[PDB]
Design an enzyme around this catalytic site. Structure first.
Site, short mmCIF file in Angstrom:
data_model
loop_
_atom_site.label_atom_id
_atom_site.label_comp_id
_atom_site.label_asym_id
_atom_site.label_seq_id
_atom_site.Cartn_x
_atom_site.Cartn_y
_atom_site.Cartn_z
N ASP A 35 40.21 35.85 32.84
CA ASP A 35 38.87 35.96 32.35
C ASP A 35 38.26 34.62 32.00
O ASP A 35 38.56 34.10 30.93
CB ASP A 35 38.94 36.85 31.09
CG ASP A 35 37.63 37.19 30.44
OD1 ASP A 35 36.58 36.82 30.99
OD2 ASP A 35 37.66 37.83 29.37
N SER A 199 21.08 28.47 37.83
CA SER A 199 20.84 28.82 39.23
C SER A 199 19.38 28.43 39.57
O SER A 199 18.48 28.61 38.75
CB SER A 199 21.07 30.32 39.45
OG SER A 199 20.73 30.74 40.76
#
EC number: 3.4.23.22
Length: 330
Positions: A35, A199
């Protein structure tokens, strides 16, 4: 030194990926969920209440010659889905695909929430976010990656997750055969302790690319792609019959529909998630409604580039002094 381990989807939907990890001497193999959205290495153990263990492989520190109780230290964590676990801390030798770390804190679960109890395939978690998120108190512990950095040829780890197929987690090197073209590196902000990045935009199917800043985290521990409501509504408006359902808790679509692709930007590069990756199958067996892979992050507070997005790319987690995230098409 380097390490290389195969990661395997736990089910037919890619709900989670498990990687075998060896803990203690002689080794005890546990299948852990790597994770990058948390920083604790916790496992099910001989100290976990019997009623909360349902078929998992447990870690037994009394059978390990290198186990040492980290006296006084305890841990307590809660995840984004509402799940939680707590207990005491041991130190032991931990090896991932041949890469060995001695004196790694292994958090022994004393109590686990029902979500983990029902997932028999997952024996624990191996946190790969920054060590500032570790819950061990009073002495905060380092993640496996942070402890391994000293021995690695390069302070990097790569994630190459498969679509309904096994993948690979590499430590200390970049496999130039796992991707096509070049790798695009983008800046990481370690301010919240996550692999946080920005992004440069998105496109829905064959539509035009919308240049807009989407700040989010690269998180292997989250199954879906959680984006702002404006982005999510524009994706699902292209699928006839798609709608947000309150009973389900998210967007659903007719199983008969063909989903468009989703493109996200990384600097000047584009990463395309094929339509099939966004299909999470029927909400229930035999259902006509299918669960969507792209969901709104509005109720979460953070955008999460989870497994749906990461599995479409070869991802480099560069943990050098100035951390960066690299993405390449595969």
């Amino acid at each position: 030194s380097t390490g290389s381990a195969t990661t395997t989807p736990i089910d037919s939907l890619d709900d989670a990926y498990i990687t075998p990890v060896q803990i203690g001497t002689p080794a005890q193999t546990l299948n852990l969920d790597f994770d990058t959205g948390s920083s604790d290495l916790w496992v099910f153990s001989s100290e976990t209440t019997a009623s909360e263990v349902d078929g998992q492989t447990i870690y037994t520190p009394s059978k390990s010659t290198t186990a040492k109780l980290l006296s006084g230290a305890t841990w307590s964590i809660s995840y984004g889905d509402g799940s939680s676990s707590s207990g005491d801390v041991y130190t032991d030798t931990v090896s991932v695909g041949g890469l060995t770390v001695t004196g790694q804190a292994v958090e022994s679960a004393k109590k686990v929430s029902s979500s983990f109890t029902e997932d028999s395939t997952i024996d624990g978690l191996l946190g790969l976010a920054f060590s500032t998120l570790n819950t061990v108190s009073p002495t905060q512990q380092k993640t496996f990656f942070d402890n391994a950095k000293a021995s690695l040829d390069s302070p990097v780890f790569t994630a190459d997750l498969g679509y309904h197929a096994p993948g690979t987690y590499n430590f200390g090197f970049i496999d130039t055969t796992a991707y096509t073209g070049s790798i695009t590196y983008t800046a990481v902000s370690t301010k919240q302790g996550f692999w946080e990045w920005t992004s440069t935009g998105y496109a829905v199917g064959s539509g035009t690319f919308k240049s807009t800043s989407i700040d989010g985290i690269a998180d292997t521990g989250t199954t879906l792609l959680y984006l702002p409501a404006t982005v999510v509504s524009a994706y699902w408006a292209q699928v006839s019959g798609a709608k947000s359902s309150s009973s389900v808790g998210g967007y659903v679509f007719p199983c008969s529909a063909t989903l468009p692709s989703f493109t996200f930007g990384v600097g000047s590069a584009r990463i395309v998630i094929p339509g099939d990756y966004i299909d999470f199958g029927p909400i229930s067996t035999g259902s006509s409604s299918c669960f969507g892979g792209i969901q709104s992050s509005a109720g979460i507070g953070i955008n999460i580039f989870g497994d749906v997005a990461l599995k479409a790319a070869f991802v480099v987690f560069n943990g050098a002094t100035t951390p960066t995230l690299g993405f390449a098409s595969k």
